[PDB]
Design an enzyme around this catalytic site. Structure first.
Site, PDB file in Angstrom:
ATOM      1  N   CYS A 130       0.826  -1.172   0.000  1.00 44.13           N
ATOM      2  CA  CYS A 130       0.000   0.000   0.000  1.00 44.13           C
ATOM      3  C   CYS A 130       0.885   1.256   0.000  1.00 44.13           C
ATOM      4  O   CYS A 130       2.006   1.258   0.550  1.00 44.13           O
ATOM      5  CB  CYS A 130      -0.922  -0.034   1.220  1.00 44.13           C
ATOM      6  SG  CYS A 130      -2.002   1.419   1.322  1.00 44.13           S
ATOM      7  N   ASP A 132       0.482   3.915   1.627  1.00 45.27           N
ATOM      8  CA  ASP A 132       0.540   4.450   2.984  1.00 45.27           C
ATOM      9  C   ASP A 132       1.999   4.648   3.403  1.00 45.27           C
ATOM     10  O   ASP A 132       2.808   3.724   3.295  1.00 45.27           O
ATOM     11  CB  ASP A 132      -0.090   3.396   3.879  1.00 45.27           C
ATOM     12  CG  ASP A 132      -0.476   3.896   5.268  1.00 45.27           C
ATOM     13  OD1 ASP A 132       0.400   4.325   6.051  1.00 45.27           O
ATOM     14  OD2 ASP A 132      -1.687   3.754   5.583  1.00 45.27           O
ATOM     15  N   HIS A 199      -1.740  -4.142   5.289  1.00 45.83           N
ATOM     16  CA  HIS A 199      -1.350  -3.693   6.613  1.00 45.83           C
ATOM     17  C   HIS A 199      -2.552  -3.420   7.511  1.00 45.83           C
ATOM     18  O   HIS A 199      -3.680  -3.228   7.042  1.00 45.83           O
ATOM     19  CB  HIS A 199      -0.451  -2.462   6.496  1.00 45.83           C
ATOM     20  CG  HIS A 199      -1.174  -1.261   5.976  1.00 45.83           C
ATOM     21  ND1 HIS A 199      -1.750  -0.316   6.805  1.00 45.83           N
ATOM     22  CD2 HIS A 199      -1.421  -0.854   4.711  1.00 45.83           C
ATOM     23  CE1 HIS A 199      -2.332   0.614   6.072  1.00 45.83           C
ATOM     24  NE2 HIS A 199      -2.138   0.319   4.800  1.00 45.83           N
ATOM     25  N   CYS A 210      -5.973   0.119   6.892  1.00 52.43           N
ATOM     26  CA  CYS A 210      -5.853   0.564   5.507  1.00 52.43           C
ATOM     27  C   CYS A 210      -7.131   1.291   5.107  1.00 52.43           C
ATOM     28  O   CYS A 210      -8.176   0.654   4.985  1.00 52.43           O
ATOM     29  CB  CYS A 210      -5.649  -0.634   4.586  1.00 52.43           C
ATOM     30  SG  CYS A 210      -5.234  -0.138   2.918  1.00 52.43           S
TER      31      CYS A 210
HETATM   32 ZN   LIG Z   1      -3.232   1.098   3.170  1.00 49.42          ZN
END
Ligand SMILES: [Zn+2]
Ligand SMILES: [Zn+2]
Ligand SMILES: [Zn+2]
Ligand SMILES: [Zn+2]
Lengths: 471, 471
Positions: A130, A132, A199, A210
């Site tokens: 991801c 992130d 995650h 997420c």
């Molecule tokens: Zn994420």
């Protein structure tokens, strides 16, 4: 604490922890984050300087002493209406912090690292986490995977990686095996490995997970796994004669940086309930000798494969796959210790959620892969990846805009200096991204709330980063 | 007339002209263009029907008898303020004309055609003309090149084709030779052939040429030639071990459809002053027996390679290249005759410049490749190819908007039905293009002056065309 039982009253040190690497990784994290974060107190000082009297030398001197560089005069011309060019200075100083951090940490292990992939049965390792920022440290921190010419990291909101693009890379990589025999010849029994990383937060599951999957951990896992399966189906069906890949799914608890790795069966299939949780492995080997601790990990991976019922597979994973997974788990023990030793438990409240300093779009930086440093979206156009861009802007609306700060955006691409015209096509690309983000967020742009830095860099690891003007 | 000397008082029929092909191509051109053009007189009639009085059945009956199909009732609800839905009806009827024309002309020659490429030393034939509607008939008319799985046609404003995309195609094709031996095995001495096509008007050089290059024929030629060289440099430098391609440059006089083909030397390099002009070849062989005419052509190509001075090359083109070029020239003779026989000279004044019926974006239609039928831009995103889209809109501003007509745009992509998820990714793409063109020309879209049709089609030639809703 799920790995270090005795906290807070006694701190764990794991016998497989690489202490010198943890020191080097910690120096890097603090130094880099400092360069960015110190810009903010500096701007506060500038903001309190009286308008109407000359303060150019005063500002230049404070910049030199606080940031270790000067500012261009034209950013020091207050405008009669809005005063100090704080937005302009923020963007400039933030670009300089990125330059300084990448120059400082610009980089034998090379060949040894590809030799290890090869021995495990892989000729490429392609990883999609991801976007992130708390997975930004995935390679040098969470997994301790060295940077090589055949190690990819391409992040997407919710791990929803680009299947057609990954297919194109598979094709290019396979052709190279046939034509050049790099990293090995095409007759060798290796496969391209695609890894997806999802995650979750164990301390705040419903809020800090997420967001692309609504902080539903099951939905985040299942989406990442479905994308892996869809990529395998593309390679297998787009090409004749038994074309195939290996897949691996890894979950990360962002509170502690501990991984859980889903173990494939003998046919390469993954299961959401068949995995080794490194938090349990850490606790189970904490009091053992290093060699014994390695045996336990090797046994935990095999035990996951003898599973029936929900976790039932068709036999055990190949020996190379199990070796590869063991090494990831072993490396990640150092990272569980890294957080424990620095924070006395999980990451502190101010570092549990999003705390990214910039958005990175494009090919990403090899040099600054640090947790919560940057939200990273791999893309060649805004048009094809508009959601990844929108998610970074949402995050930075809370982080930066809520406090009057612009959103700093680094656009960065790799080119091949041996190919005539490659540098220029890459620059043209970098400038398309810039105009396309400006047009998509035009009111933010009108307010000088988007601060961009464009750069380009030869594909070899260690190449200098070349800054390019927006026009 | 530059090919048929005796016009207007006597019409030429070349002994190498394929008469049955000319007839079938003519039937196709007149029938297809009719389906589109008859929409306009029909709309004029609808426009004259009184508002306020029911005329649904009257419009449905006129549509059936004029157009050979009915209209959906919801298009026949006049809006209370602006009356008849002429823009909606125009779009609908134009999409139905496209459906009818591709269904009617939807399609042994297959394997024979690839065998000819192979024999000439080519394993792929990849052609990039200018997006200009008057090159739309390039393959079935100007060159008489059959449609095969290894014949590509990808049009760009000014012939400025996509080098990275072409590199990726080269890689995919080359891998297929290694893994599957299709269309041949990788040990065979064949090369990927890239052809670029530039164009000019002999009767109106400064106005009716390539507008992408300011109607400067020298600039149009030089740009197309530079793009070929740049693509060759990419393949050679991006890959080890003697990676290479063949290149060919072709000029077209859009007044007569005659080609001029630039002859490569023995090292594969092209020269702006070394070419055979088919207009001179047509006149020099007009009174010969077929076999003698073929010897002249073979000799004309060799004589171009005899050239010193400005046109000097390092030797003669390969025997396979010269055979390929001879066949293109022979086929084009038929096309010179086609125009002469239909028009009594060059295309008539109304067909000298732009006269396109729609804009086509994406992968193009195999079934309706007819001069001045469509402006065609090959692209996977608007972002990367904005200029190609802008040029089509500019052209349709004069053609259509100047007379109150919307611009009809067909968005069309191919997918692989054997690949799970390929169809859905391609539909998502088609919808991105739709939204991206709508946002780029939002005031045109607000006025209902952009009428779209999206469709998708399995990659095998002859597959049905599947229309897809814009959402
Ligand atoms: Zn994420
Ligand atoms: Zn000031
Ligand atoms: Zn009406
Ligand atoms: Zn043109």
């Amino acid at each position: 604490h799920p790995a270090c039982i005795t906290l807070p009253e006694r701190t764990c040190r794991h016998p497989l922890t690489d202490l010198e690497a943890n020191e080097q990784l910690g120096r890097c994290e603090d130094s880099v984050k400092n360069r960015f974060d110190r810009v903010i107190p500096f701007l506060q000082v500038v903001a309190g300087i009286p308008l109407g009297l000359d303060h150019v030398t005063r500002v230049q001197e404070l910049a030199q002493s606080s940031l270790g560089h000067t500012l261009p005069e034209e950013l020091l011309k207050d405008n009669w209406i809005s005063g100090h060019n704080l937005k302009g200075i923020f963007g400039y100083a933030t670009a300089k912090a990125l330059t300084a951090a990448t120059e400082q940490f610009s980089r034998d292990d090379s060949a040894s690292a590809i030799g290890f992939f090869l021995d495990c049965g892989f000729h490429a390792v392609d990883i999609s986490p991801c976007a992130d920022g708390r997975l930004k440290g995935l390679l040098p921190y969470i997994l301790r995977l060295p940077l090589t010419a055949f190690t990819y990291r391409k992040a997407y909101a919710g791990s929803m990686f680009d299947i057609e693009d990954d297919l194109a890379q598979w094709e290019k990589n396979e052709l190279r095996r046939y034509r050049e025999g790099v990293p090995n010849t095409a007759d060798q029994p290796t496969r391209y490995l695609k890894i997806a990383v999802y995650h979750f937060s164990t301390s705040d599951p419903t809020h800090s997970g997420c967001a692309a999957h609504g902080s539903n951990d099951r939905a985040a896992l299942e989406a990442a796994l479905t994308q892996l399966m869809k990529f395998r189906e593309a390679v297998e069906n787009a090409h004749c004669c038994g074309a195939s890949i290996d897949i691996l799914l890894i979950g990360v608890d962002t509170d502690t940086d501990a991984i859980r790795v889903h173990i494939p069966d003998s046919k390469g299939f993954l299961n959401p309930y068949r995995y080794v949780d490194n938090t349990v492995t850490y606790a189970q080997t904490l009091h053992l000798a290093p060699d014994e601790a390695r045996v336990i990990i090797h046994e935990a991976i095999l035990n996951a494969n003898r599973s029936d019922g929900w976790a039932k597979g068709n036999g055990v994973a190949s020996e190379g796959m199990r070796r590869f997974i063991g090494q990831l788990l072993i490396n990640n023990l150092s990272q569980i210790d890294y957080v424990v030793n620095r924070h006395g438990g999980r990451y502190p409240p101010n570092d549990i959620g999003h705390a990214e300093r910039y958005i990175s779009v494009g090919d990403g930086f090899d040099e600054v892969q640090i947790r919560n440093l940057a939200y990273y979206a791999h893309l060649d156009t805004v048009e094809e990846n508009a959601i990844d861009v929108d998610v970074g802007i949402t995050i930075f609306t809370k982080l930066n805009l809520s406090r009057g700060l612009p959103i700093p955006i680094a656009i960065h691409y790799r080119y091949d200096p041996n190919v005539p015209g490659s540098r220029e096509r890459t620059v043209v690309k970098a400038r398309r991204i810039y105009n396309a983000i400006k047009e998509r967020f035009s009111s933010l742009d009108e307010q000088n709330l988007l601060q961009f830095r464009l750069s380009v860099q030869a594909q070899d690891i260690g190449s200098p980063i070349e800054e390019v003007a927006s026009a």
